[PDB]
Amino acid sequence: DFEEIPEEYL
Amino acid sequence: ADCGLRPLFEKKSLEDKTERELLESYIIVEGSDAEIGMSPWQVMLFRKSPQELLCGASLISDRWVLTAAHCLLYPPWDKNFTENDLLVRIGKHSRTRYERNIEKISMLEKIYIHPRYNWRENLDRDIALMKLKKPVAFSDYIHPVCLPDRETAASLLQAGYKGRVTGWGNLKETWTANVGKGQPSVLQVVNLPIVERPVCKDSTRIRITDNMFCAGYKPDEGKRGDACEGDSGGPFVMKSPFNNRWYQMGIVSWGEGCDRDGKYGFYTHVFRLKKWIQKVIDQF
Numbered sequence: 516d517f518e519e520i521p522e523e524y525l
Numbered sequence: 526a527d528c529g530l531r532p533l534f535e536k537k538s539l540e541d542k543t544e545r546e547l548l549e550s551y552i553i554v555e556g557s558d559a560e561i562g563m564s565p566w567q568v569m570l571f572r573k574s575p576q577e578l579l580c581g582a583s584l585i586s587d588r589w590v591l592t593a594a595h596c597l598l599y600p601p602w603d604k605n606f607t608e609n610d611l612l613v614r615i616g617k618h619s620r621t622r623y624e625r626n627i628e629k630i631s632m633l634e635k636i637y638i639h640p641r642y643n644w645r646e647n648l649d650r651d652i653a654l655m656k657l658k659k660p661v662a663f664s665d666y667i668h669p670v671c672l673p674d675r676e677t678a679a680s681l682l683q684a685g686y687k688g689r690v691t692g693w694g695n696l697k698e699t700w701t702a703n704v705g706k707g708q709p710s711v712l713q714v715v716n717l718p719i720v721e722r723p724v725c726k727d728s729t730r731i732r733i734t735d736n737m738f739c740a741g742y743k744p745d746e747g748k749r750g751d752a753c754e755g756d757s758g759g760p761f762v763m764k765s766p767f768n769n770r771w772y773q774m775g776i777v778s779w780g781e782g783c784d785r786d787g788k789y790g791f792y793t794h795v796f797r798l799k800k801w802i803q804k805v806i807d808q809f
């Protein structure tokens with residue numbers, strides 16, 4: 516359901 | 526110092542669609558779609574993996590985020606999140622989309638939970654602060670809400686006076702998703718009336734403390750609305766008619782069912798815990 520955020524913050 | 530004044534509203538002297546409802550009273554289930562920039566202090570506590578929404582929260586400065594303690598620590602549900610487990614998403618409107626160029630994602634530096642938070646019995650002192658690793662940049666969608674002082678709390682925390690609750694929580698108490706109405710596409714808002722302490726107490730068997738207040742409509746009032754799963758940690762605000770600034774009087778804490786007749790939502794009394802907030806911020 517949740518769109519993929521940029522890996523930069525993961 | 527510039528808190529409680531939204532870029533897209535107070536700053537340009539525009540009013541949002543329901544703020545007049547609150548002023549008229551001065552002497553999320555069944556809510557509605559929030560306007561853009563209507564709640565610049567709204568924060569989403571986000572779990573790294575599996576990526577999901579943990580709670581609501583609020584921005585009180587460029588480095589501090591306020592929320593409910595039970596959002597981070599709740600032994601009954603085996604909940605005990607640590608700094609790196611989370612992320613704070615600010616400047617959002619859509620629940621699931623990554624709002625490029627508008628939202629800002631922050632990593633947590635340190636969690637501070639109230640030392641006397643009662644998770645064992647009644648969620649007493651359900652409050653927690655989060656310090657961000659780096660300051661967040663204010664914008665049209667990102668701005669801090671103000672924290673109440675003794676006088677402000679005294680004049681606004683009265684039965685009948687309405688407040689505003691926002692969040693991306695469920696639309697209905699009864700388990701539902703994107704198929705039969707359950708999760709909202711965008712931020713939800715609802716204005717609710719503060720309720721008389723005796724009434725709050727008579728609505729439950731749980732022991733109610735002075736660190737909490739309850740809000741919501743009575744069955745006789747016809748109007749509905751309440752927070753729900755996914756909304757905790759979120760802000761309960763009020764617009765001061767004295768200086769036209771938004772103040773966070775409460776924190777979405779707990780209830781017994783969502784939008785139930787004869788029942789009400791309970792919120793953490795922010796002002797009663799301000800000394801603790803100050804100390805933490807001043808000490809760190």
Ligand SMILES: N=C(N)NCCCC[C@H](NC(=O)[C@@H](Cc1ccc(O)cc1)NC(=O)[C@@H]1CCN1C(=O)[C@@H](CC1CCCCC1)NC(=O)[C@H]1CC[C@@H](CNC(=N)N)CC1)C(N)=O
Nearest residue numbers: 646647648752753754757777778779780781782783790791
């Ligand atoms: N994770 C789980 N295992 N279960 C999730 C249960 C969620 C219940 C739901 N809660 C929530 O959505 C959120 C946010 C909120 C705050 C105020 C408000 O007016 C509305 C929502 N907050 C919370 O999760 C906090 C931590 C425990 N919370 C509760 O609501 C408690 C209330 C008390 C718990 C003892 C210590 C003092 C506080 N109840 C619950 O989990 C129960 C929910 C359903 C039952 C009736 N349904 C049933 N099948 N038996 C009544 C109570 C709500 N409003 O009751």
